[PDB]
Amino acid sequence: ARKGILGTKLGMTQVFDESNRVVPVTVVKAGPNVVTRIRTPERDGYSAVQLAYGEISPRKVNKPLTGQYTAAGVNPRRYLAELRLDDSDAATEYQVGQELTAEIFADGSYVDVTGTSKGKGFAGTMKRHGFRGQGASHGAQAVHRRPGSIGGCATPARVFKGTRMAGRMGNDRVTVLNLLVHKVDAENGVLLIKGAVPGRTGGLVMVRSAIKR
Amino acid sequence: IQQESRLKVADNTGAKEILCIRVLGGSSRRYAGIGDVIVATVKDAIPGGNVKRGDVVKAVVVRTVKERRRPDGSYIKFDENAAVIIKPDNDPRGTRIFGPVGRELREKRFMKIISLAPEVL
Amino acid sequence: MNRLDFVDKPSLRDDIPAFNPGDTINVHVKVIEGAKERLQVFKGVVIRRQGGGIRETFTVRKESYGVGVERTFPVHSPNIDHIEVVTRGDVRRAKLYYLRELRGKKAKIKEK
Amino acid sequence: AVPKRRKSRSNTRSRRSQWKAAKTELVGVTVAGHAHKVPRRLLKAARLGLIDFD
Amino acid sequence: PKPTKGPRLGGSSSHQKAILANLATSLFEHGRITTTEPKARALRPYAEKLITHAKKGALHNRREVLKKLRDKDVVHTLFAEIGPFFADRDGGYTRIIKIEARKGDNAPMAVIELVR
RNA sequence: CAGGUGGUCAGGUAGAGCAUACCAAGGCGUACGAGAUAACUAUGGUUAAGGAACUCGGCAAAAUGCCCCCGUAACUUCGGG
RNA sequence: AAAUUCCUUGUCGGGUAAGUUCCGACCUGCACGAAUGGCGUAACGACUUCUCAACUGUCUCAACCAUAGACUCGGCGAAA
RNA sequence: CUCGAUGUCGGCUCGUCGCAUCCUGGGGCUGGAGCAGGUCCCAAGGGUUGGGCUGUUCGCCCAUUAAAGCGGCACGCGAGCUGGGUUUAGAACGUCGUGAGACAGUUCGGUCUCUAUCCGCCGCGCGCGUCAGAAACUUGAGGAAACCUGUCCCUAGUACGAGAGGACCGGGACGGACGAACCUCUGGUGCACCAGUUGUCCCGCCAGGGGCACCGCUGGAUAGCCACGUUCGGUCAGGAUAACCGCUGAAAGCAUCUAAGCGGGAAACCUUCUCCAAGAUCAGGUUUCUCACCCACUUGGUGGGAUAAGGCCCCCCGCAGAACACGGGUUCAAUAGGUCAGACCUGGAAGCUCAGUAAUGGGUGUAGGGAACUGGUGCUAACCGGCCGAAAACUU
Ligand SMILES: [Mg+2]
Ligand SMILES: [Mg+2]
Ligand SMILES: [Mg+2]
Ligand SMILES: [Mg+2]
Ligand SMILES: [Mg+2]
Ligand SMILES: [Mg+2]
Ligand SMILES: [Mg+2]
Ligand SMILES: [Mg+2]
Ligand SMILES: [Mg+2]
Ligand SMILES: [Mg+2]
Ligand SMILES: [Mg+2]
Ligand SMILES: [Mg+2]
Ligand SMILES: [Mg+2]
Ligand SMILES: [Mg+2]
Ligand SMILES: [Mg+2]
Ligand SMILES: [Mg+2]
Ligand SMILES: [Mg+2]
Ligand SMILES: [Mg+2]
Ligand SMILES: [Mg+2]
Ligand SMILES: [Mg+2]
Ligand SMILES: [Mg+2]
Ligand SMILES: [Mg+2]
Ligand SMILES: [Mg+2]
Ligand SMILES: [Mg+2]
Ligand SMILES: [Mg+2]
Ligand SMILES: [Mg+2]
Ligand SMILES: [Mg+2]
Ligand SMILES: [Mg+2]
Ligand SMILES: [Mg+2]
Ligand SMILES: [Mg+2]
Ligand SMILES: [Mg+2]
Ligand SMILES: [Mg+2]
Ligand SMILES: [Mg+2]
Ligand SMILES: [Mg+2]
Ligand SMILES: [Mg+2]
Ligand SMILES: [Mg+2]
Ligand SMILES: [Mg+2]
Ligand SMILES: [Mg+2]
Ligand SMILES: [Mg+2]
Ligand SMILES: [Mg+2]
Ligand SMILES: [Mg+2]
Ligand SMILES: [Mg+2]
Ligand SMILES: [Mg+2]
Ligand SMILES: [Mg+2]
Ligand SMILES: [Mg+2]
Ligand SMILES: [Mg+2]
Ligand SMILES: [Mg+2]
Ligand SMILES: [Mg+2]
Ligand SMILES: [Mg+2]
Ligand SMILES: [Mg+2]
Ligand SMILES: [Mg+2]
Ligand SMILES: [Mg+2]
Ligand SMILES: [Mg+2]
Ligand SMILES: [Mg+2]
Ligand SMILES: [Mg+2]
Ligand SMILES: [Mg+2]
Ligand SMILES: [Mg+2]
Ligand SMILES: [Mg+2]
Ligand SMILES: [Mg+2]
Ligand SMILES: [Mg+2]
Ligand SMILES: [Mg+2]
Ligand SMILES: [Mg+2]
Ligand SMILES: [Mg+2]
Ligand SMILES: [Mg+2]
Ligand SMILES: [Mg+2]
Ligand SMILES: [Mg+2]
Ligand SMILES: [Mg+2]
Ligand SMILES: [Mg+2]
Ligand SMILES: [Mg+2]
């Protein structure tokens, strides 16, 4: 009974609730979605539904993708993603060409928001893993942000797999759990979600009903 | 407020300045705000007063230089860090409070201090 | 203009008098003292207006009992009953932070 | 840190062959009737006559 | 305009300020300048803002331009010919044309010129 | 070749000054460059609240700093301090 | 109980919330002692040692900025 | 074994493993009334504090905590750091020696080198393969990360207990530590922002400004990056079990948890939540597009050439970024710049005028200046283009 929608992160603001408390909200433009495809067990081995979101010029879509959209008889969109349902497909509640909007959620509900975190570039150990570094005085020689030891000795004469080191950081797929939907605005089709949502403003975001609630 | 911080005593026990020894409320707790309980030592007192220098006491923070958020989105910030020496039952050992105090004492259940204070903000 | 202006518009409050840093202000705030909802008044000098519309805040400073106090409220906060302007000040800057280390007679502000 | 032993011919050559120049793609342009070949990023300069073909 | 992201031209920011002023003076004086491509790209908006001041063409704008340029003859021609020439054009007063890189350091080069 | 090398001359404004800052006369831009917001290193700068809790140790940094007028302890070899 | 004391962090007192260091004594001086000087001593010390005020990125606990490198392109072009 | 050198204590930084378990979890017995214990068995998922003294390890102590575990890894870790002790040359005390000197006695001082070749590890690309060439969406074989805990309240002053004292089990609220994302708020920073101001020099002079002095200094400060900030998390539910507790039940007419069989049973293990993932060479699945030529030859599952779908380079850019890659755009264009208008930051421009002997003040005027955010605008540059790139059969 999972519900899902694709949207765009519009940014953060603040609002006040009935108890006169400030609520930091992230505004998500859960735009209108089209389905374009259903994954059935008998045909693919699992249950899911595709979702198409985002206005795009037909000139910018190549022939294969255009043919895929033509088969389902919908106009091409920018993004395309699948909402993985449970094994109980029920082969219904989703017809090809159906439109989804933001009213599939309600005030006071809980959602799961997944996105792509902002890129951080090549990052050192202190930033990437919270290493303590070394001292800034008392004789320390050029090791103020260096990791220090990375192993033992002749036993063992190697470095183990998965040791924390410096490298590229960010641009990961991240999901945040149990975000309260403060309010859904039906006219402009946005969701006011309390808290922080991964990624940058304008990034694609998928909103799903929380499994744990 | 953390360990080694010094605070001004806001009551009439005779102590002037105390030094924070431990922030109670859990192992390795770092900062004590308004409404938090402190183990402290008396670094200065009025001569021939009730409390002497070097006594280990228990106190509650009532004023902080660092501004503190409130659930409605407002903040409060004082010009000094001040505490009140209390008894094991959370009653102040002194008889009156000097200066204003923060409203978080209400939710921390320090009603006696709240009543004794000249002003609650 | 901002992208979230349509979101923030219904929550913008009216009846906010125009005031600037340096002015003297009465702020009537709601207080939950049990289940009573009385109205406490904070009287002091505005020292800051960090802009932003629905997220704009301001800070007021006073001296209660030998101790200086600062309160930072969001403009448009429903917890503020009303704002009342007492006097207008004459200052040269926008942040008035220097008042944080002046006491007594040196801390006053001109009255125009 | 110094090399422990000299590299073999194969190991040296595998790395050494990766030091090479990338070739620039050229387009066609005619100036004063004479036809030349220039990198595309200099097409505007070639048309306006700021390119010395030598 | 938008500040340089990354290290400033010619060493420091004060040197970059001087470099931009000198390049703008030379561009207004000659109508056409050949330099390194990063310098031309940095110069473009800086020069267009001065041309906008000259288009406005008041005493206040002249003082604003003099805050940056030190060549009074160049200021005069900027306020007497350049601004009047571009009175009817809204933005886009310059143009960058990429040319062959120079020997010695293979630095990419370009010319920047007033549109006419 | 960022080291070393005796003597002479030595302007202005501010300043006690041959210190220091900006200039004159006179010299020079000194010999790889052009780019680019990686980590990390170096040299500088700023930092909420706390204030030596750091550490072998206040190492390093921060702080004090000028002129004029008051005032100045124990001790002392009577000069000082 | 020392630039001398092994036992030893000797015992008592002060200082600290907590003092193997410090200061004052005790004398059980392993192994002090009178020109290889004994005991003091105002002034002096880039000497050793303990405490305090002030101050601070030393630290809680890190964050940001500029520059020189590191990184890319062209030229020259080593070493263990 | 190492003398043609294997760097020696303590500390920092980074860890990893064992269980002989310190806390949290589950039990048996008890000289276990209850609260609390003792002892033994199972259990290694997570957690296991900050200071004073000492070169210290160790140890004593202070204040907390649910707890302040014990060990291996060259007594882990100096081509990662330090150099307080030890272990050179200086000097002194005690003691020993006639002396030179000596002392696992003491004391003060005392150079820590190296551009990473290989393996290993952390990241990122290029090629090829996956039997035509491509594009989009995917399954999950198998891995990785995470796993903490307190206080208060109801039950209930109930059970128990002479009283004192004081429950099990269930049901709520608020915390501490840790981690992730994010920038609305608070707070920090801010080198092409605004304002004040000192010295000096310059713009012919006044006025107005500019260069240098750490960004000269000082007061602020949008964007971005951030934590001291905001939000969220570690849950619930199944399965098989450890210790342990059983049902049925003979051998052995009784008994017996067991030899047949069937149950309960923990933070341990497997599913469940998050992330990676078909180089998973067993190289997967669902789809959609092109689906086409010409030349030579020893006619070859042969060499070439030209293309389709598609892609790349070039070009304008990015909150994507070391290069590379990734994302967006390229006139049917709002991509960057300019420009106009907002938002916001600063705080009342210049010129003119009035007042004042003057320093200065008032008016014109929420002024002027201005970056990052938002919207309009087709003015500048995104061009008049190059390189890649599609199939022998055969068996049932
Ligand atoms: Mg640090
Ligand atoms: Mg060192
Ligand atoms: Mg060094
Ligand atoms: Mg250093
Ligand atoms: Mg090995
Ligand atoms: Mg404002
Ligand atoms: Mg910047
Ligand atoms: Mg300068
Ligand atoms: Mg020389
Ligand atoms: Mg000499
Ligand atoms: Mg002179
Ligand atoms: Mg000099
Ligand atoms: Mg000079
Ligand atoms: Mg350079
Ligand atoms: Mg680079
Ligand atoms: Mg600070
Ligand atoms: Mg401060
Ligand atoms: Mg101190
Ligand atoms: Mg210490
Ligand atoms: Mg320590
Ligand atoms: Mg020093
Ligand atoms: Mg200094
Ligand atoms: Mg003795
Ligand atoms: Mg002796
Ligand atoms: Mg002793
Ligand atoms: Mg000490
Ligand atoms: Mg003594
Ligand atoms: Mg004699
Ligand atoms: Mg002797
Ligand atoms: Mg003698
Ligand atoms: Mg002597
Ligand atoms: Mg003596
Ligand atoms: Mg001397
Ligand atoms: Mg000396
Ligand atoms: Mg001694
Ligand atoms: Mg090179
Ligand atoms: Mg040997
Ligand atoms: Mg030998
Ligand atoms: Mg050898
Ligand atoms: Mg270990
Ligand atoms: Mg065991
Ligand atoms: Mg009993
Ligand atoms: Mg037991
Ligand atoms: Mg365990
Ligand atoms: Mg597990
Ligand atoms: Mg070792
Ligand atoms: Mg070393
Ligand atoms: Mg080593
Ligand atoms: Mg060591
Ligand atoms: Mg080694
Ligand atoms: Mg030493
Ligand atoms: Mg020593
Ligand atoms: Mg010697
Ligand atoms: Mg003798
Ligand atoms: Mg010896
Ligand atoms: Mg190295
Ligand atoms: Mg799996
Ligand atoms: Mg494998
Ligand atoms: Mg993070
Ligand atoms: Mg913002
Ligand atoms: Mg802020
Ligand atoms: Mg400026
Ligand atoms: Mg000046
Ligand atoms: Mg003047
Ligand atoms: Mg000059
Ligand atoms: Mg900001
Ligand atoms: Mg039975
Ligand atoms: Mg592209
Ligand atoms: Mg004016």
Tab-separated table of C-alpha atoms in Angstrom, chain C residues 8-104:
chain	number	residue	atom	x	y	z
C	8	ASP	CA	4.841	32.556	2.602
C	9	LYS	CA	2.123	35.056	1.642
C	10	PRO	CA	-0.845	33.731	3.703
C	11	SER	CA	1.269	33.681	6.880
C	12	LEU	CA	2.387	37.316	6.676
C	13	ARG	CA	0.962	39.404	9.506
C	14	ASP	CA	-0.492	42.890	9.335
C	15	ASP	CA	-0.758	45.579	12.012
C	16	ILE	CA	3.040	45.656	12.318
C	17	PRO	CA	4.093	49.268	12.977
C	18	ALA	CA	7.123	50.548	11.084
C	19	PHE	CA	10.115	50.672	13.411
C	20	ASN	CA	13.866	50.870	12.914
C	21	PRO	CA	16.924	50.009	14.996
C	22	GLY	CA	17.354	52.477	17.827
C	23	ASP	CA	13.645	52.859	18.556
C	24	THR	CA	12.073	52.069	21.915
C	25	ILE	CA	9.413	49.398	21.664
C	26	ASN	CA	6.793	47.669	23.787
C	27	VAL	CA	6.338	44.017	22.814
C	28	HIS	CA	3.267	42.276	24.232
C	29	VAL	CA	4.013	38.547	24.238
C	30	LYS	CA	1.728	35.678	25.160
C	31	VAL	CA	2.873	33.509	28.064
C	32	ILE	CA	1.583	30.074	29.065
C	33	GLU	CA	1.793	30.093	32.874
C	34	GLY	CA	-0.023	26.832	33.441
C	35	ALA	CA	-3.214	27.315	31.415
C	36	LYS	CA	-3.727	31.076	31.759
C	37	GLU	CA	-2.354	32.924	28.685
C	38	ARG	CA	-1.534	36.285	30.217
C	39	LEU	CA	0.325	39.056	28.353
C	40	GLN	CA	3.857	39.988	29.399
C	41	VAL	CA	5.437	43.190	28.093
C	42	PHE	CA	9.077	43.548	27.067
C	43	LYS	CA	10.186	47.184	26.834
C	44	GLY	CA	13.571	48.007	25.379
C	45	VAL	CA	15.594	49.283	22.444
C	46	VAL	CA	15.586	47.634	19.031
C	47	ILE	CA	19.159	46.821	18.051
C	48	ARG	CA	18.760	44.645	14.967
C	49	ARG	CA	16.530	43.734	12.025
C	50	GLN	CA	17.892	40.731	10.113
C	51	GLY	CA	15.680	40.952	7.057
C	52	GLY	CA	13.789	38.356	5.080
C	53	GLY	CA	10.042	38.881	5.129
C	54	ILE	CA	8.345	35.910	6.775
C	55	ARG	CA	11.660	34.960	8.356
C	56	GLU	CA	12.608	38.474	9.462
C	57	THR	CA	13.511	38.815	13.128
C	58	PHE	CA	14.423	41.647	15.476
C	59	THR	CA	16.192	41.975	18.809
C	60	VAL	CA	15.278	44.115	21.811
C	61	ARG	CA	17.595	44.966	24.693
C	62	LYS	CA	16.867	46.289	28.176
C	63	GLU	CA	18.347	46.373	31.682
C	64	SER	CA	16.177	44.693	34.310
C	65	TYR	CA	18.086	44.368	37.604
C	66	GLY	CA	21.688	45.312	36.950
C	67	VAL	CA	21.665	42.685	34.175
C	68	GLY	CA	21.146	43.296	30.466
C	69	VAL	CA	18.681	41.088	28.609
C	70	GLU	CA	18.122	40.513	24.902
C	71	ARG	CA	15.050	38.989	23.278
C	72	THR	CA	14.993	37.976	19.615
C	73	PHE	CA	11.561	37.596	18.111
C	74	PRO	CA	10.446	36.713	14.600
C	75	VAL	CA	8.397	39.449	13.041
C	76	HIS	CA	5.002	37.959	12.095
C	77	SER	CA	5.225	35.591	15.064
C	78	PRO	CA	1.675	34.820	16.260
C	79	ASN	CA	3.019	34.731	19.827
C	80	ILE	CA	3.326	38.536	19.719
C	81	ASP	CA	0.023	40.222	20.511
C	82	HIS	CA	0.944	43.686	19.245
C	83	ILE	CA	3.965	45.962	18.921
C	84	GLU	CA	3.817	49.522	20.249
C	85	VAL	CA	6.355	52.224	19.423
C	86	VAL	CA	7.322	54.534	22.273
C	87	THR	CA	10.107	56.757	20.902
C	88	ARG	CA	12.125	57.071	17.705
C	89	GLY	CA	15.905	56.990	17.967
C	90	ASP	CA	18.676	58.709	16.022
C	91	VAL	CA	21.529	56.345	15.173
C	92	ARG	CA	24.158	56.097	12.467
C	93	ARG	CA	24.310	52.348	11.779
C	94	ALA	CA	21.984	49.373	11.479
C	95	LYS	CA	23.184	46.931	14.154
C	96	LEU	CA	23.866	48.853	17.403
C	97	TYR	CA	26.000	46.028	18.811
C	98	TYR	CA	28.117	48.574	20.691
C	99	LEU	CA	25.283	48.918	23.203
C	100	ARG	CA	26.280	45.509	24.578
C	101	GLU	CA	29.171	47.024	26.555
C	102	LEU	CA	27.737	50.365	27.700
C	103	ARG	CA	26.015	50.850	31.050
C	104	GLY	CA	24.202	53.688	32.746
